Amino acid sequence: IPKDRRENLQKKLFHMQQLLPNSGLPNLDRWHSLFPLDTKATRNSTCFGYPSWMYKAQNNKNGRHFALRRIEGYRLTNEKAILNVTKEWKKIINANIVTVHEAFTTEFFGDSSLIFVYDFHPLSETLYDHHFPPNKIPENLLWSYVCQIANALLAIHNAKLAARCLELSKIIWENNRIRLAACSILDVLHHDSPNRKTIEELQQEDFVKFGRIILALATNTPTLNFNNIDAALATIVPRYSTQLRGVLEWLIKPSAPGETKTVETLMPMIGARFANFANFVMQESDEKEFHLMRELENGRIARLMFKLSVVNERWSETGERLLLKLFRDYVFHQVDADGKARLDTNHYLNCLSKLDASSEEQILLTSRDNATVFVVSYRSIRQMLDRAYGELGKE
Amino acid sequence: IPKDRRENLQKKLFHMQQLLPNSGLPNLDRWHSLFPLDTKATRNSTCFGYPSWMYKAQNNKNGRHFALRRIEGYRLTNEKAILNVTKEWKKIINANIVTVHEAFTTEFFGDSSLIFVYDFHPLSETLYDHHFPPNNSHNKIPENLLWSYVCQIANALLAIHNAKLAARCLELSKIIWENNRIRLAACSILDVLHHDSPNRKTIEELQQEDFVKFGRIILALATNTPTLNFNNIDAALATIVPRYSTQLRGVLEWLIKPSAPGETKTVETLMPMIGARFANFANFVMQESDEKEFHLMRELENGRIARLMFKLSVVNERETGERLLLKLFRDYVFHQVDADGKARLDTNHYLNCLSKLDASSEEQILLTSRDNATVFVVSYRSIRQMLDRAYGELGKE
Ligand SMILES: Nc1ncnc2c1ncn2[C@@H]1O[C@H](COP(=O)(O)OP(=O)(O)OP(O)(O)=S)[C@@H](O)[C@H]1O
Ligand SMILES: Nc1ncnc2c1ncn2[C@@H]1O[C@H](COP(=O)(O)OP(=O)(O)OP(O)(O)=S)[C@@H](O)[C@H]1O
Ligand SMILES: [Mg+2]
Ligand SMILES: [Mg+2]
Description:
five-stranded antiparallel beta sheet, Helix Hairpins, alpha+beta, homodimer, binds phosphothiophosphoric acid-adenylate ester, Single alpha-helices involved in coiled-coils or other helix-helix interfaces, three-stranded antiparallel beta sheet, 3 domains, Transferase(Phosphotransferase), domain 1
């Protein structure tokens, strides 16, 4: 657990518990301690047709943290069966889709608001805000985005559904991992609108919105228009590979001369980039595995110190336990040439690691009166510790 | 953190430390504590042309555990065979390839042996032994798992071929399995043992042999036939059509058959054939990596608990003052005895006390001194603040 990852995982735990008491936010029937997640001071109705609000809240029943998406000013009776379509989205298990649990309307916000509950992903930021704060992205990261979004659309389309909402502000970023964070919403907000589209047509719009998102990132232009669909498409050939340009072209262009666009057709176009991506995720999962084991090592190290602390100053004054006493002094009571304490976390860690591994390496244990000195190995010290601790269990 | 997952990580750590006191194995110039990994009492020379031995050993320099592949009865007749091979393979780092570090000869085994050192992956079992258990004899593997293998092996071949090299050794017994993660565990070996052989093959045909050996491995697993023969490359190929999808059959057929009518087989051509199965595979890996992320944060308490023990051990027994409560706190946590006088050992008590110390719990405890006249009512929160305070005053010096 190096410095950055350990404090990042602590920053995550800190974000999950994080509260803001004076905010003047209401408590729902099954939710409390609502925490505002919006990082910007402006809200527009371009994405949903209504203003949107984001919240982190605690469940009254299980105490775990969830994310709440609020759609301001939407009227719909809570008892309506349409809100239950989130149950179909719940069935979809995907790493690039934020799982939705349920949907309900509420009036605790002083109006008519619709609430979607999602998994809470700590330290998440929108893909827009991450790449466009108020200078080009590497192609590997762009392909990582292409592979992740395609993976999401694959599961969605095969579930006889569509993304509907596919934009930069509605995709959350967290350590290069992206997820669709507004699914199942438009399913409700467009259930009985004029000019309803088919799930077949909506699935096609996904591919178009897909291409535009990546194209925007590739051309480093936040606002994207139709008048430059071929202008910005030709700007990526020297900077990025022709393969990247080819995928963007396929996604954006209305490919309907003899056939309709399908996710299965998109996959071979990606091809080798999937292997590269999968390789990276596998290696990152490997790194998480070592940190897991290091942390489990810490537990074994803590349990060794438990035994050691039980024995010390408890019989314990003199004997084979006297060496255990002197061993503790060796590890934690180190002082400099002046006489001042030499605090050293590294020394503590490596001493106990060698004790846990029963290292054959030897160390010098000086007695209280610097007259007697013990040449002893970690292996011997470990065996004395287990021996003495067991003799206390006989009682 | 499910039951099996915690015990899996504990089985790994226990496997790395595992020793054999009665062993008659020597210590090498740079290696010691050699531990036998072989699951069988018999060794044949089919895989390498020489008997092979597997060992876990500790590095004298860094103290970490590595895997050692020993090739019995090998004399170095050319230093080019080790150096021209290992200089290229050492550079290749892949998630589906066991990293090789170096190769050297030794005589400590009472003979002339060649030694390869690899990364040590705990709890690893050969893909053969996992799907064909050793202690049983002669019922199908799920298709998703077969596709997982195809993606992983293809990923390995992708890195290998792009380095102008070949797997050479691509068989069930030379691939290690660990929680559905497979790795090529015999790379760079045949590169050395065949470095100056009479009938040296081209790097391109050896690469073609990779695809064939690829196909046979998956086909063997799909047909539940450990040994695979040339006479049933089309017979066993027809056993998979009702049980598995036609796509799998198409890939296996493509891999095994000498596909050179209009083009020669390349990994880039294999990728679109797998296609959507890569999305499925990557999704699972992402999902498992997500599950580890949540499990990590929960486990982080061990570091926080251990660092607290560091502070507590530094301060204690270095006599009187505010640290006297820290001394009495240690007595409360680890020195519990009954009215009778017997030791009250409790691993749970130790863990939960420190959890409350780590959480700065508002829960209160009773601290009676040796002199019973004064007793301190204090919470874990206050004790926690006293500990950091005392530990900080030692940093002033
Ligand atoms: N499912 C989620 N889990 C955790 N955090 C989230 C989730 N969804 C959104 N957030 C965070 O909430 C913040 C705001 O959410 P997004 O609303 O949808 O963007 P919004 O920028 O504030 O844009 P406006 O104008 O509504 S469209 C972002 O910074 C995210 O980091
Ligand atoms: N790099 C490694 N890291 C950890 N364990 C390994 C590694 N490589 C091999 N092993 C294990 O070592 C054991 C024996 O190695 P493998 O020898 O090559 O099996 P072996 O099948 O009996 O084949 P050989 O003797 O040619 S017949 C296996 O159970 C593996 O799981
Ligand atoms: Mg918002
Ligand atoms: Mg062997």
